[PDB]
Amino acid sequence: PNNFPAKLWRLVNSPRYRSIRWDGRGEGLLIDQPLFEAELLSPPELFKTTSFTSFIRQLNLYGFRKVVLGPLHHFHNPHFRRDQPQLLVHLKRLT
Amino acid sequence: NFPAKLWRLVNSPRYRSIRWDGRGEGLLIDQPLFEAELLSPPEPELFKTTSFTSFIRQLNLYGFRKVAGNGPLHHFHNPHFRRDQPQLLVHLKR
Amino acid sequence: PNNFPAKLWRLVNSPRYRSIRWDGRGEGLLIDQPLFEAELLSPPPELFKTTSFTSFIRQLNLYGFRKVVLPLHHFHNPHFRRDQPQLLVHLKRLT
DNA sequence: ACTCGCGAATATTCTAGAACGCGAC
DNA sequence: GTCGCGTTCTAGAATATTCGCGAG
16 A cells, blocks of 8 residues: 555645645645744654655655755655545555 | 454444544544554454454554544544445455 | 664663563563553654554564563564663564 | 755555464254 | 364564765
C-alpha cells in the first residue's frame, strides 16, 4: 500500500491544513514551516515525527524537490498535480 | 465459524465495539471496548482468546486488510465481507 | 535516546520504571503490560515513539528475546543478563 | 556558509509461517 | 482416531524515522 502520497494529497488539498497548500498553479506545494510544526508535528492526521527535517526526508524519498527561481518551502513532483490526480499512482519510494 | 461470528458481531447492535463502517464496505473496531466486552468478562458470543492480537491474526488469515470512542479505531476490509451481499461469505478461506 | 539494547538495559535496571524489571535470577525480564503502556508508552525522557505494546514486542523478538517456557510477560535472551553486561555486545537485530 | 537531497541504520507497522492443543466430526 | 481450526509466538518485508554528510 502507498499511503504517504494519499496522505500528502489530503493535507495539501484540505483547508484545515493551512500550513501546507497548493501553489498558485496547482503544480507544487507550499509549506509554512512554523505553522506546519505547530499543527501537524506538535499536537490525514498526525505524523509520528516532531522534526520538520524528517518530513522533508519523506518528501525527497517520494521524489519531491525544491523549486528553483514569505519564507515558504516550495516543492514539486511531476506526478503531484491538482488537475491530474490520476498521476498520484506513480508516486513511489525507490526500490 | 469465524466468518459467521464476525458477521453476527458486526451486524448486532448489542456489540458496540465492532460495526459496519459508514459506507458498509468494511468493519470498524474500537479496541478498548472490544477487549472489555468481547475478550474478557463484559446469549453471548464468546471468543476463546483474550488477546486482541490473536483476533487480528484471525482477520488477516481470512484475507482482511487494514485500510470514534476513545482509542485506536481499526478499519479492516475484505471484498467478500459485505453488508448488502452476504452470499459472498462462502468465499472466505483461511 | 540510544540503541534498543542500551535503552532496555536502562529500563530493566532502573527502579523508576516499575513495569519492566529483572526476574528473580537476573537472567530474564518481567514486564507488567498495563503499567508499561501507562508509563513507557503513554505520552503526557525514555519514551519510545510507538504507543503499541505489540511494536515493543516486535523489538524484543528482533533482538533475540524469547518468552520463557512455563498480563505479566517473562522474556529472556542469553546475552542480556544482570551480572554480565559484557554480553550485551553480542545482541544483534535479525535482519 | 548554509541548504538540498541521498545513504544507511534503526524503529515501526502490517501481515504471515508454523507449532500445538482442542473440538467437531 | 483424524483433520481443520484457533491460538500463540516469532519473523519477513515495506515504510517511516533518524542521523549524518557531500556537493554546490
